[PDB]
Amino acid sequence: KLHKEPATLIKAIDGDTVKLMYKGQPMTFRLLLVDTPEFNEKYGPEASAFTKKMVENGKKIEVEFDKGQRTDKYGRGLAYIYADGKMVNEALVRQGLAKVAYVYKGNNTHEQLLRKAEAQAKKEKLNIWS
């Protein structure tokens, strides 16, 4: 089973990448199963702003690694990130500020939940889907 673990915000970087103190070591995390636009792309600043606000304003930030590979090729931790028990990955997709990403190395536990969010944001023609 997956477990949520505590972490502390160091700096929000963009829509899908965030730097956290995890077990007393600073690490860059990349959100599983979502792709936000890059800052210089349409909805990029909006996605960055969204993730920044959610993590900065949360009382408690948690990381939940999945069952597949835990780091990407660029050294980033691959997790679901929660702020006060709300998943940032899902919130971005349901807001139409990220699309669901390909599965990477077995990390698929929340794929269906995120696809459901995405279908609803698309039906609502929200943001990226506008």
Residue positions annotated with a catalytic role: 30, 38, 76
How is residue 75 written in tokens?
A: 């050294």
Sign (positive/negative) of CA torsion 100, 54, 110, 130?
Answer: negative
Interface positions with Ca ion (CB under 5 A): 16, 35-36
How is residue 58 written in tokens?
A: 């949360």
How is residue 60 written in tokens?
A: 């408690």
Question: Any known ligand binding at 84?
Answer: no
Closest approach of Cβ 45 to Ca ion, in Å?
A: 13
How is residue 88 written in tokens?
A: 């940032």
Question: Any known ligand binding at 36?
Answer: yes
Closest approach of Cβ 59 to Ca ion, in Å?
A: 27
Q: Distances in Å between the alpha carbon of 73 and those of 78, 83, 88, 130?
A: 10, 26, 22, 33
Closest approach of Cβ 88 to Ca ion, in Å?
A: 14
Nearer to Ca ion, 36 or 95 (CB): 36
Question: Any known ligand binding at 51?
Answer: no
**Residues contributing to the annotated binding site for Ca(2+):** 16, 35-36
**Residues contributing to the annotated binding site:** 16, 35-36
